Design an enzyme around this catalytic site. Structure first.
Site, PDB file in Angstrom:
ATOM      1  N   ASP A  10       0.820  -1.214   0.000  1.00  0.00           N
ATOM      2  CA  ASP A  10       0.000   0.000   0.000  1.00  0.00           C
ATOM      3  C   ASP A  10       0.849   1.257   0.000  1.00  0.00           C
ATOM      4  OD1 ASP A  10      -2.668  -0.301  -0.415  1.00  0.00           O
ATOM      5  OD2 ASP A  10      -3.297  -0.036   1.669  1.00  0.00           O
ATOM      6  N   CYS A  33      10.134  -7.436 -10.938  1.00  0.00           N
ATOM      7  CA  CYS A  33      11.405  -6.782 -10.646  1.00  0.00           C
ATOM      8  C   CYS A  33      11.795  -5.829 -11.770  1.00  0.00           C
ATOM      9  CB  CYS A  33      12.502  -7.828 -10.439  1.00  0.00           C
ATOM     10  SG  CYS A  33      12.395  -8.737  -8.854  1.00  0.00           S
TER      11      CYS A  33
HETATM   12  N1  LIG Z   1      -1.105  13.204   4.090  1.00  0.00           N
HETATM   13  C1  LIG Z   1      -2.013  13.391   3.117  1.00  0.00           C
HETATM   14  N2  LIG Z   1      -1.884  14.477   2.300  1.00  0.00           N
HETATM   15  C2  LIG Z   1      -2.771  14.719   1.305  1.00  0.00           C
HETATM   16  N3  LIG Z   1      -3.808  13.869   1.130  1.00  0.00           N
HETATM   17  C3  LIG Z   1      -4.010  12.768   1.905  1.00  0.00           C
HETATM   18  C4  LIG Z   1      -3.090  12.497   2.948  1.00  0.00           C
HETATM   19  N4  LIG Z   1      -3.492  11.400   3.532  1.00  0.00           N
HETATM   20  C5  LIG Z   1      -4.609  10.973   2.936  1.00  0.00           C
HETATM   21  N5  LIG Z   1      -4.941  11.801   1.937  1.00  0.00           N
HETATM   22  C6  LIG Z   1      -6.172  11.666   1.011  1.00  0.00           C
HETATM   23  O1  LIG Z   1      -7.374  11.097   1.648  1.00  0.00           O
HETATM   24  C7  LIG Z   1      -7.650   9.759   1.112  1.00  0.00           C
HETATM   25  C8  LIG Z   1      -7.901   8.692   2.225  1.00  0.00           C
HETATM   26  O2  LIG Z   1      -6.746   8.630   3.056  1.00  0.00           O
HETATM   27  P1  LIG Z   1      -6.804   8.309   4.640  1.00  0.00           P
HETATM   28  O3  LIG Z   1      -7.759   9.196   5.358  1.00  0.00           O
HETATM   29  O4  LIG Z   1      -5.453   8.407   5.195  1.00  0.00           O
HETATM   30  O5  LIG Z   1      -7.227   6.807   4.906  1.00  0.00           O
HETATM   31  P2  LIG Z   1      -7.623   5.436   4.246  1.00  0.00           P
HETATM   32  O6  LIG Z   1      -8.852   5.667   3.456  1.00  0.00           O
HETATM   33  O7  LIG Z   1      -7.865   4.500   5.565  1.00  0.00           O
HETATM   34  N6  LIG Z   1      -6.551   4.781   3.412  1.00  0.00           N
HETATM   35  P3  LIG Z   1      -6.225   3.292   3.118  1.00  0.00           P
HETATM   36  O8  LIG Z   1      -5.938   2.627   4.421  1.00  0.00           O
HETATM   37  O9  LIG Z   1      -4.949   3.319   2.132  1.00  0.00           O
HETATM   38  O10 LIG Z   1      -7.357   2.603   2.437  1.00  0.00           O
HETATM   39  C9  LIG Z   1      -6.467   9.460   0.204  1.00  0.00           C
HETATM   40  O11 LIG Z   1      -6.794   8.677  -0.932  1.00  0.00           O
HETATM   41  C10 LIG Z   1      -5.921  10.811  -0.227  1.00  0.00           C
HETATM   42  O12 LIG Z   1      -6.584  11.359  -1.376  1.00  0.00           O
HETATM   43 ZN   LIG Z   2      11.819  -6.869  -7.434  1.00  0.00          ZN
END
Ligand SMILES: Nc1ncnc2c1ncn2[C@@H]1O[C@H](COP(=O)(O)OP(=O)(O)NP(=O)(O)O)[C@@H](O)[C@H]1O
Ligand SMILES: [Zn+2]
Ligand SMILES: Nc1ncnc2c1ncn2[C@@H]1O[C@H](COP(=O)(O)OP(=O)(O)NP(=O)(O)O)[C@@H](O)[C@H]1O
Ligand SMILES: [Zn+2]
Lengths: 280, 276
Positions: B213, B258
């Site tokens: 991920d 790879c």
């Molecule tokens: N540090 C960041 N800076 C800018 N955008 C972010 C950041 N973190 C998350 N996002 C955005 O918000 C979306 C969801 O991220 P997040 O809230 O961290 O959790 P999530 O849905 O649990 N992710 P995942 O566990 O990979 O399925 C992402 O696809 C990004 O578009």
């Molecule tokens: Zn590799």
């Protein structure tokens, strides 16, 4: 075919996959909103326009005491500041919060029918700022030969949700809290330079404002003063004589002019004798 | 001396009513906790431990975000105690979804969300320690350097709940690989290095861990899934809350491709026999 990690490196990674101790230190402090009396030209205070802040700021205060000092219209209680947004107040520093006596409110209710307490507080802080502006002019123009500068504490407006009320707040001064002159127009006999300068400052305010204003009740610790009485020398209205709520003695300006004794600082400032005539 | 009218006016103005309109504060105050390190400059040989003294930070809501298990909102930090957070900087605050809290409700008796947040932050720190080692050992012929953002623990009374907070990145946010082993086809050196990194973690940890991920902006990553590749149960397979399929490891080894970076790093074929 590789250079993998060591025991220490492996230990530090695997430990993160487990529950690690987290002991959040208990929450102490009371949330409050701080309001400030802003200035248009803080650098030239005596030529600056005062206006109240609009958007309140967050702060947290520790009510570490039940000791309510004073015998006047208000009571002062020490508190501690844990934190203040933008550090308007100083974290880990003692402050004094002042509120009026119900009686006093009841009395002003017949003038301030609404939000009596808040209004009295607004006036108390504006009164101190007036004193600060006069001291700013004083220190700026006073002769270089004068080594002391009267200084009034900055006072902020505070609203306590928990206590459901407004307060005036200022830094808590540690030291012998004394009074140089009072609301009767009486003064102490100076023993040193500091006191001579404090006493002369009151005389100077009367002269400098061409007789319109007199600052009495100079009191605090050393050079740092608080809670002065800015008196409108000629007003006659019931409660319009002093910028902030204060009980003036029997004809205080009269007494002051009659009892004040000029000192080495008064002469250093070229001030004329109060006992002289107003017209002649 | 000189007692002007402007000076007199501003003094006398204080004796009268000056307009006052109490306006409630903007935003909300929150309490921030940090996962400290005993040796920052040598992060992979440093011990992580939670801070105890929570520091205040002032945040203001701006907008939003959703992914798999979390809701995210962008905020502005206007001030904070001892600069635990950077004033004038943008941050993203994340909280877990209903289903996820309901999935760990049994695992974590009380303070379910608190523990979910603690584990999520710890998981990202693990990946960070790995990227740190990577940048230390990788060949100088490999330019870029993957890096995971630091995540802080946050408590908000306004909402009465715990959250995770991290710096907001600016730029196009993209996923390089996922939990099931899918990978993008690298269209540049940086994406290659990213794909090579997941492979490197497996080999570097002797097949014990795998970071999947990989996602973020440029070389800055967040929201990784650190997998204990040897567990035979998903429930004890991932460091923090993560959507994994028991096929993850096998799938990655079968699907991973790879590239020039993998070869630059002298990484063996993931398909090879493990007892050979
Ligand atoms: N540090 C960041 N800076 C800018 N955008 C972010 C950041 N973190 C998350 N996002 C955005 O918000 C979306 C969801 O991220 P997040 O809230 O961290 O959790 P999530 O849905 O649990 N992710 P995942 O566990 O990979 O399925 C992402 O696809 C990004 O578009
Ligand atoms: Zn590799
Ligand atoms: N800044 C301060 N630092 C330390 N102590 C203070 C400070 N201000 C006031 N005090 C103390 O608390 C008492 C109450 O102060 P204050 O409310 O100004 O009373 P006052 O002079 O009687 N005025 P008032 O209440 O208007 O009648 C003082 O007499 C001091 O002993
Ligand atoms: Zn004099």
């Amino acid at each position: 075919t590789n250079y993998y990690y060591s025991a220490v490196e492996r230990n530090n990674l695997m430990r993160l996959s487990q529950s690690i101790p987290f002991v959040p230190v208990p929450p102490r402090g009371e949330p409050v909103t701080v309001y400030r009396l802003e200035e248009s030209s803080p650098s030239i205070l005596n030529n600056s326009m005062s206006s109240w802040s609009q958007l309140g700021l967050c702060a947290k205060i520790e009510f570490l005491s039940k000791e309510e000092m004073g015998g006047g219209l208000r009571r002062a209680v020490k508190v501690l500041c844990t934190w203040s947004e933008h550090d308007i107040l100083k974290s880990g520093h003692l402050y004094i919060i002042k509120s009026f006596l119900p009686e006093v409110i009841n009395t002003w209710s017949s003038i301030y029918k609404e939000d009596t307490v808040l209004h009295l507080c607004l006036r108390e802080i504006q009164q101190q700022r007036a004193a600060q502006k006069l001291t700013f002019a004083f220190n700026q123009m006073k002769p270089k030969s004068i080594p002391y500068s009267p200084r009034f504490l900055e006072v902020f407006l505070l609203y306590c949700h928990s206590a459901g009320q407004w307060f005036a707040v200022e830094e808590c001064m540690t030291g012998e809290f004394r009074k140089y002159n009072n609301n009767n127009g009486d003064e102490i006999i100076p023993t040193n330079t500091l006191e001579e300068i404090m006493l002369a400052f009151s005389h100077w305010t009367y002269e400098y404002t061409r007789g319109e204003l007199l600052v009495l009740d100079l009191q605090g610790v050393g050079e740092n003063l608080t809670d002065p009485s800015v008196i409108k020398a000629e007003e006659k209205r019931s409660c319009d004589m002093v910028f902030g709520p204060a009980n003036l003695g029997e004809d205080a300006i009269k007494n002051f002019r009659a009892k004040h004794h000029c000192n080495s600082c008064c002469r250093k400032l070229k001030l004329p004798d109060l006992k002289r005539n107003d017209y002649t």
